[PDB]
Paper text:
Degradation of polyP into phosphate is involved in phosphorus cycling, and exopolyphosphatase (PPX) is the key enzyme for polyP degradation in bacteria. The PPX hydrolyzes and releases the Pi progressively from the linear polyP chain. Bacterial PPXs share conserved catalytic domains 1 and 2 belonging to the catalytic N‐domain, and most members of the PPX family contain two additional domains 3 and 4 in the C‐terminal. The exopolyphosphatase belongs to the ASKHA (Acetate and Sugar Kinases, Hsp70, Actin) superfamily protein, which utilizes a common fold for binding and catalyzing hydrolysis of ATP phosphoanhydride.
Protein crystal structures of PPX homologs from different bacterial species, including DrPPX from Deinoccocus radiodurans, AbPPX from Acinetobacter baumannii, and KpPPX from Klebsiella pneumoniae, were determined and refined to resolutions of 1.8‐2.6 Å, respectively (crystallographic data together with the data collection and refinement statistics were summarized in Table  1). While the KpPPX and AbPPX crystallized as a symmetric dimer, the DrPPX crystallographic structure exhibited an asymmetric homodimer. The AtPPX has a ɑ‐linker consisting of 9 amino acids (Gly298‐Ser306), the KpPPX and HpPPX have ɑ‐linkers of 12 amino acids (Ala296 – Gly307, Gly285‐Leu296, respectively), the EcPPX and AbPPX have ɑ‐linkers of 15 amino acids (Ala296 – Lys310), while the DrPPX has a ɑ‐linker of 20 amino acids (Ala300 – Ala319). Among the PPXs, the DrPPX which contains the longest α‐helical linker exhibited the smallest dimeric interface (1136 Å2) as calculated using the PDBePISA server, while the PPXs with shorter α‐linkers had a larger dimeric interface. The shorter α‐linker (AtPPX, KpPPX, and HpPPX) enabled the C‐terminal domain 3 to interact with domain 2 of the N‐terminal, while the longer α‐linkers (DrPPX, EcPPX, and AbPPX) facilitated the interaction of C‐terminal domain 3 with domain 1 and led to a relatively loose dimer formation. In the DrPPX apo crystals grown in the presence of ammonia sulfate, sulfate ions were observed in the cleft of the N‐terminal domain of the apo structure of DrPPX. In terms of the polyP hydrolysis activity of the PPXs, the DrPPX with the longest ɑ‐linker exhibited the weakest activity, while the KpPPX with the shortest ɑ‐linker showed the strongest activity, demonstrating a strong negative correlation of ɑ‐linker length with PPX activity across the species. Superposition of apo‐ and NTD structures of DrPPX revealed that truncation of the C‐terminal led to an enlargement of the cleft between domain 1 and domain 2 of the N‐terminal.
Author numbering: 0 to 383, 402 to 508
Write the structure that this text describes.
C-alpha cells in the first residue's frame, strides 16, 4: 500500500509524519513513524525578519534528518509545508530554494488560512469533534483560530500572537512583578488584535474548544502533574486531555511569579522555560475572550492534516479515472513514481488542455487520453493495457520529449512517427511541461484559473503556486511558446 511522507516547518519546531494508506480507498492511514526537530527558526531572524544563515543551517539539517527517515521507510519524496517564520521572512523564497539545493526538499510557504484548515483536519484525526468546535493553534509565530463542524473548518483567522513573537515583543524586567507585567501586557495585545473578530469564535451553547501544538501540550502535562499525576509519557501522551480555564489561570499565575530559570523546573514545562510565560498568557487571554470554560488538547495537528488532504487528492483522482487510466496509474506505481505528483500533473494537464480547446485549438480524438497517460508516466525512469501499440509509442514520446532526440535520426532504432503524430507529440509535451512546472514544489495545490489568447500568444492565471512553481513554468514553457505562442503567467 502507498507510503507517504509529509512534514511541516514551523517557527519553534519542525514535524514529520510517515504513514501508509489503508485499503479500500477510504482516505485513511496507519502511522509508521513520526519525528520532531527543534528547529527554532523564530530565534534565527534578524531585525527585518530575515532568516539568518544559521537558521538556514538549522532548516537544512532538519530536512536532511527528515529525508533520511522517509527514505529508510520507503516513503520516497517528502512534501514540506512552511508556516509563519518562512512566510514572513523577506528572504523566505531565496532560503527555500537554497534549502532545496542542499537537501532535495522544498519548504513551500502556505497561508495562515490554509495552515488553519489543515491543522483542524489533523485535530479531527486525533480527538472527538462535535457539531460546533473552536480550535486554537498557538505556535511560535502565529495563533490560528478555527471554527467548524464534524468534518472540516468553516472559518479561519490567523493573528501574529505567537509565543516566540510575544516573548520577544514584551521583554521582561527583573522586578518582583516583572512576570505578571509581561502577562498583563501580552493579554492586552491579544484582546486588541482579537476584539474585532472574536464573535466569529465565541462560545455558544454546546461549543467544544480544542488546543493543538507544543504550548498547549506542555500546559496539559503541567496541569495534570499539578492535579497529582505523573509525567505525560505515562498514558501515552496528552491527547484528549481536558483542563479548565481556571486550571490554566492558576498555572499562569504560578509561572508568572517565578524567574525564567525556575520556569524550566516547573514539571511539564522543562523544555519551554524561555517562552512559556508569554505563551500561557496568550492562551488564557484568548480563551477568556471567547468565553471558553474548558478545552481538550489534541496531539494531531498540521502534519496529520497534510496526510489526509494528500490521500484525499490521490484517491479522488484515481476514482474518477477510466479503468484504462487506472491501470496506467498502477503501472506508474509499480515503476516507483510519486502518485500524488503524477495525479496533480495529469489534472493540471487536463485543465490546460480543456481551455485550449475552448479557445479554438484543435486536437485529434485520443489526444486527451495520451496526455493523461504521459502525465502519469512522466517520471518513470524504466520507461524512458487498453492502449494500441501506436498510442503507447505516442505516450512514450510525449513522456520523454526532448528537442535533441537521444538517438540521432540516422541512428538505428530511431523511431520516426508520421508528421501529424510528430506535431501532436510536441504540442501535448508542451502542455505537460507547463503542468509539471506547476507542481515543482510537490504541494498538490496549484490550480488553473484562466487561459486566454493574448495576441498570437496566451495568458495563464494560476492560484496555489509557490515561487518555485512559477519559475518552473518559465523554464519549461519554452516548448509551449514554440508551439502555441508566447505564454505569460500571473498570480
Ligand atoms: Mg514531474
Amino acid at each position: 500500500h502507498m507510503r507517504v511522507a509529509v512534514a511541516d516547518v514551523g517557527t519553534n519546531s519542525s514535524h514529520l509524519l510517515i504513514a501508509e494508506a489503508l485499503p479500500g480507498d477510504a482516505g485513511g492511514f496507519r502511522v509508521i513513524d513520526t519525528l520532531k526537530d527543534r528547529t527554532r527558526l523564530g530565534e534565527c531572524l534578524d531585525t527585518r525578519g530575515e532568516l539568518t544563515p544559521e537558521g538556514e543551517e538549522r532548516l537544512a539539517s532538519a530536512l536532511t534528518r527528515f529525508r533520511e527517515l522517509a527514505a529508510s521507510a520507503g516513503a520516497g519524496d517528502v512534501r514540506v509545508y512552511a508556516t509563519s517564520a518562512l512566510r514572513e521572512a523577506p528572504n523566505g523564497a531565496e532560503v527555500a530554494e537554497r534549502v532545496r539545493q542542499r537537501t532535495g526538499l522544498y519548504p513551500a510557504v502556505i497561508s495562515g488560512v490554509r495552515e488553519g484548515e489543515l491543522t483542524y483536519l489533523g485535530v479531527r484525526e486525533a480527538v472527538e469533534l462535535g457539531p460546533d468546535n473552536v480550535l486554537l493553534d498557538l505556535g511560535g509565530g502565529s495563533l490560528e483560530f478555527v471554527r467548524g463542524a464534524e468534518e472540516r473548518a468553516a472559518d479561519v483567522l490567523s493573528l501574529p500572537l505567537g509565543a516566540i513573537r510575544m516573548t520577544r515583543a514584551f521583554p521582561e524586567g527583573d522586578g518582583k512583578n516583572a512576570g505578571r507585567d509581561v502577562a498583563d501586557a501580552v493579554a492586552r495585545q491579544v484582546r486588541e488584535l482579537l476584539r474585532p473578530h472574536a464573535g466569529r469564535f465565541a462560545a455558544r451553547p454546546g461549543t467544544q474548544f480544542f488546543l493543538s501544538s507544543g504550548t498547549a501540550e506542555a500546559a496539559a502535562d503541567a496541569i495534570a502533574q499539578r492535579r497529582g499525576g505523573r509525567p505525560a509519557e505515562a498514558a501515552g501522551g496528552v491527547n484528549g486531555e481536558r483542563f479548565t480555564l481556571t486550571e490554566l489561570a492558576d498555572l499562569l499565575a504560578h509561572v508568572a511569579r517565578l524567574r525564567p530559570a525556575q520556569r524550566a523546573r516547573v514539571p511539564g514545562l522543562e523544555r519551554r522555560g524561555d517562552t512559556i510565560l508569554a505563551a500561557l498568557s496568550v492562551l488564557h487571554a484568548a480563551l477568556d475572550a471567547l468565553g471558553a470554560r474548558e478545552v481538550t488538547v489534541s496531539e494531531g495537528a498540521l502534519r496529520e492534516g497534510m496526510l489526509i488532504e494528500e490521500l484525499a487528492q490521490v484517491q479522488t483522482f484515481s476514482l474518477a479515472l477510466s479503468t484504462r487510466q487506472r491501470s496506467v496509474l498502477a503501472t506508474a506505481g509499480r515503476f516507483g513514481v510519486n502518485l500524488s505528483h503524477a495525479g496533480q500533473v495529469a489534472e493540471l494537464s487536463r485543465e490546460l488542455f480543456d481551455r485550449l480547446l475552448a479557445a479554438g485549438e484543435t486536437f485529434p480524438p485520443p489526444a486527451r487520453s495520451l496526455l493523461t497517460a504521459a502525465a502519469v508516466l512522466h517520471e518513470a525512469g524504466q520507461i524512458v493495457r487498453g492502449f494500441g501499440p501506436q498510442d503507447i509509442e505516442l505516450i512514450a514520446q510525449i513522456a520523454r520529449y526532448h528537442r535533441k532526440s537521444l538517438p540521432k535520426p540516422s541512428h538505428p532504432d530511431y523511431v520516426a512517427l508520421a508528421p501529424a503524430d510528430r506535431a501532436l507529440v510536441a504540442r501535448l509535451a508542451g502542455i505537460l511541461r507547463v503542468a509539471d512546472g506547476l507542481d515543482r514544489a510537490h504541494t498538490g495545490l496549484a490550480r488553473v484559473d484562466d487561459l486566454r489568447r493574448q495576441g498570437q500568444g496566451w495568458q495563464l492565471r494560476v492560484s496555489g503556486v509557490t515561487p518555485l512553481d512559477l519559475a518552473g513554468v518559465g523554464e519549461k514553457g519554452d516548448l509551449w511558446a514554440r508551439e502555441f505562442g508566447p505564454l505569460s503567467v500571473q498570480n
